[PDB]
Ligand SMILES: [Cu+2]
């Protein structure tokens with residue numbers, strides 16, 4: 001999850017290096033084209049400029065394509081890993097609550113891992129959405145709904161899991177304070 005974000009930044013940089021690379025040989029080609037067009041007419045010259053401007057435009061388009069694709073796949077993998085990570089954490093938490101006798105510290109640790117999984121998912125979804133919002137405001141307004149509902153779910157699923165803590169008030173009391181630190 002943090003392995004794939006180290007795997008995301010990597011692929012992200014390779015993509016940049018790759019782009020900046022193709023972009024450099026285009027400006028390079030542009031030059032020899034300018035020197036070679038040294039003895040050609042103006043018309044053929046005004047057209048050599050358009051050719052390379054369109055060439056650069058195409059490169060930019062592709063880089064943008066690769067980025068979006070990379071991010072999409074990234075969102076898919078992470079969403080799968082985070083849900084999986086949450087489920088397992090929710091299980092250990094519930095199992096902890098049903099312990100006989102219930103162990104406060106153990107319940108908390110399990111609860112902590114769970115809150116962090118939910119918080120990780122929320123923060124992750126928020127960060128990526130805010131990225132698009134900052135870069136492409138109009139695009140962000142498209143996925144806006146699909147993104148807020150997601151956050152609404154995570155929030156409700158966590159609060160619902162937190163309240164399970166009241167089925168064992170003695171434990172809830174003994175760790176209430178530490179739980180607050182967690183939620184802040
Ligand atoms: Cu570029």
Ligand SMILES: [Cu+2]
Nearest residue numbers: 005074078124
């Ligand atoms: Cu991410």
